[PDB]
């Protein structure tokens, strides 16, 4: 059965973990401890494929040794989440981008743009700002809310999606 390895990457508190659940157990809590990291595995079908989907929820403290940089070399594509009320998780993108081609060592990544809490009415970031974002780094944009589930499926799928054109190559 086909494998996809995908990391999610961003700021703390930017809905990683809620994503990753609701993509896996279909539901959302106002809690999740901030400070886990793992892996999670979901068999999905995508566009008639089944696969099973690894996903490495990113949490913990900011530190680069060689054996993160060799645990996240592993991943297949990434998704940089912020979330849309709160900008500095926006600016921090760039950092996590950066990270990503520096470990795989290429300027051809499989990722997607997620910005997440789309329910929420105090937005800082405009759609339009990420959308600019996004066409620069030649990646898809996606809006989410982990807490409706609203685009979740889109951004997940999007990224497998991305990986298979990327495979193409
Ligand atoms: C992820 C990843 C990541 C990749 F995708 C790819 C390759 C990586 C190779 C690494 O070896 C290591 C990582 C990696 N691991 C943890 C990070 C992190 N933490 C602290 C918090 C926020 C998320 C979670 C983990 N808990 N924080 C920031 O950056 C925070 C900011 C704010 C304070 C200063 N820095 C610089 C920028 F300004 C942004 N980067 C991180 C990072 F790159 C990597
Ligand atoms: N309104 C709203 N709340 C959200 C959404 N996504 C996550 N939350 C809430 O934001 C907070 C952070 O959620 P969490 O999933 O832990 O984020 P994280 O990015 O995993 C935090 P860490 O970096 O420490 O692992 C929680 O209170 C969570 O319920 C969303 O889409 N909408
Ligand atoms: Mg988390």
Redesign the pocket.
């Given at each position: 059965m086909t494998e996809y390895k995908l990391?999610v990457?961003?700021?703390?508190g930017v809905g990683?973990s809620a994503l990753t659940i609701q993509l896996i157990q279909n539901h959302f809590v106002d809690e999740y401890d901030?400070t886990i990291?793992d892996s999670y595995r979901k068999q999905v079908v995508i566009d008639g494929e089944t696969s099973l989907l690894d996903i490495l929820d990113?949490?913990?403290?900011?530190?680069?040794?060689?054996?993160?940089?060799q645990?996240?070399?592993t991943?297949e594509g990434?998704l940089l989440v912020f979330a849309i009320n709160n900008t500095?998780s926006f600016?921090?993108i760039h950092?996590?981008?950066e990270?990503?081609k520096?470990?795989?060592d290429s300027e051809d990544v499989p990722m997607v743009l997620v910005g997440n809490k789309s329910d929420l009415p105090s937005r800082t970031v405009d759609t339009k700002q990420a959308q600019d974002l996004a066409r620069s780094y030649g990646i898809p944009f996606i809006e989410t809310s982990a807490k409706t589930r609203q685009g979740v499926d889109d951004a997940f799928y999007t990224l497998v999606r991305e990986i298979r054109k990327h495979k193409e190559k």
């Open positions: 990391v990457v961003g700021a703390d990683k901030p990291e990113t949490a913990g403290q900011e530190e680069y040794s060689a054996m993160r940089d645990y996240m070399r991943g990434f500095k600016e921090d950092h996590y981008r990270q990503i520096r470990v795989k």
